[PDB]
Amino acid sequence: SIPTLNPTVALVAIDLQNGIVVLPMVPQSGGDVVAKTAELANAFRARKLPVIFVHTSYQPDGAVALKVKTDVPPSPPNLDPEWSAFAPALGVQPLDVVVTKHQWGAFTGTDLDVQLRRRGITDIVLTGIATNIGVESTAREAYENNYNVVVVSDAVSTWSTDAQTFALTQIFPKLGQVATAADVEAALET
Amino acid sequence: SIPTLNPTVALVAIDLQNGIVVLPMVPQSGGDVVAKTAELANAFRARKLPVIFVHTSYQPDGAVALKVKTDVPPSPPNLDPEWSAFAPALGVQPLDVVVTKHQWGAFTGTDLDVQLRRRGITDIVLTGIATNIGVESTAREAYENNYNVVVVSDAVSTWSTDAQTFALTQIFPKLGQVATAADVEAALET
């Protein structure tokens, strides 16, 4: 069923960067998530609707990476500039909004909310990697910040099909709407 | 294994209020979550460490409840003052910190971060209901805000054992530490 969308809608794409799109993920590959996101981005730009590309960086020195105590030790911060560069197939344009984050979710320490508010945006369409981590944290926070959230099922991927299903069926329906890229495109054309 | 805790630690208990503790939940009841939390609270107060009790309210008129579009329609806001009153068995004291929230997580629209910062707190021990909703959203945000987060496995409950297990094994170990109430108490006594 096609999601309900206000005209004041933005596309927000999480962590479609070289170091993350090459990771193993399901139910579609990093490449497919990138491709789907680009297709949606074209539909948004066609309507003069903002496209917001989010990437994670710990430049210049890694000191901004969280070092809080966790049971699962995190990877050390990757300081290769290519790690945080956008996937070339994503088609990031010079007038697109680029948001740089330093943790899972895309609000903390960023200008995402500033960009949304100042552009009059009420609704966000969310894509990216990983469904349960950067996507979900952004989704949860966006909901608390009174945005209508739509998550694109065939443009979010994660580490297992169980995790995908859990987020899409147990969490996201409670904080927003779950739809396919095609469903979202149809809701725009309305 | 006992969690690692700095001395600058607070107990933060989510939504142990009449309207939520009576809900069906696993792997322990609302009553058990309340009891366990009170026991920990005693251990914290004994050490002059802050105890922060969080509840959800939509008083006076329900207008502050989120009305964003979701696939699963939410319950209308319950405006019975008893719905948001703390469970009597929780033993909330007049010098305890009471935080009032209007959505899942305990930071948005609250003084939680202000209370933590001003009290010099670096570490939070988290209890309450539901594991995947108010507890997890608070945990996720606390992590992004550079707090060491510990979630108390036998003092958080949710709607299914699959959901409990997913949060405790797939999410929380990546943003903090998972331990039992007894483990936490032992880490204090160190």
Amino acid identity of residue B188, one-letter, is: L
Q: Do B176 and A145 touch (CB under 8 A)?
A: no
Tell which B residues from 19 to 78 touch A, by Cβ distance under 8 Å: 66, 68-72, 74
Geometric angle at alpha carbon A39, from A36 and A41, rounded to 5°: 110
- Determine contact: A85 vs chain B, CB below 8 A: no
Domain total of chain A? 1
- Determine contact: A147 vs chain B, CB below 8 A: yes
Strand order from edge to edge, sheet including B9-14: B97-101, B51-56, B9-14, B123-129, B148-157, B177-179
Geometric angle at alpha carbon B110, from B109 and B116, rounded to 5°: 140
- Closest C-alpha among B78, B87, B42, B86 to residue B60: B78
CATH number at residue A36: 3.40.50.850
- Determine contact: B1 vs chain A, CB below 8 A: no
CA distances from A18 to A26, A29, A80 (A): 17, 13, 10
Structural domain span for residue A56: 1-190
For B95, other C-beta atoms within 10 Å of its C-beta total 7
**Beta carbons of A30 and A23 less than 8 angstroms apart:** yes
- B14: enclosing H helix or E strand: strand B9-14
Cα distance from N-terminal residue to C-terminal residue, chain B: 13
- Closest C-alpha among B111, B110, B114, B160 to residue B133: B160
Q: Determine the Cα–Cα distance for residues A122 and A142; give it in Å rounded to an integer.
A: 10
**Beta carbons of A59 and A149 less than 8 angstroms apart:** no
Q: Do A140 and B104 touch (CB under 8 A)?
A: yes
Classify the phi-psi angles of B141: left when phi > 0, otherwise alpha if psi is within -120 to 50, otherwise beta: alpha
Q: Do A143 and B173 touch (CB under 8 A)?
A: no
**Beta carbons of A27 and A157 less than 8 angstroms apart:** yes
- Spell out where B38-131 has E strands: 51-56, 97-101, 123-129
Geometric angle at alpha carbon B88, from B82 and B92, rounded to 5°: 105
Token pair listed for B94: 């007049």
> Which residues of chain B neighbour A143 with C-beta distances below 8 Å?
66, 68, 103-104
Residue of B nearest to A160 (CA): B170
**Beta carbons of A128 and A104 less than 8 angstroms apart:** no
Q: Do A146 and B66 touch (CB under 8 A)?
A: yes
- Determine contact: A171 vs chain B, CB below 8 A: yes
Resolution of the experimental structure, in angstroms: 1.7
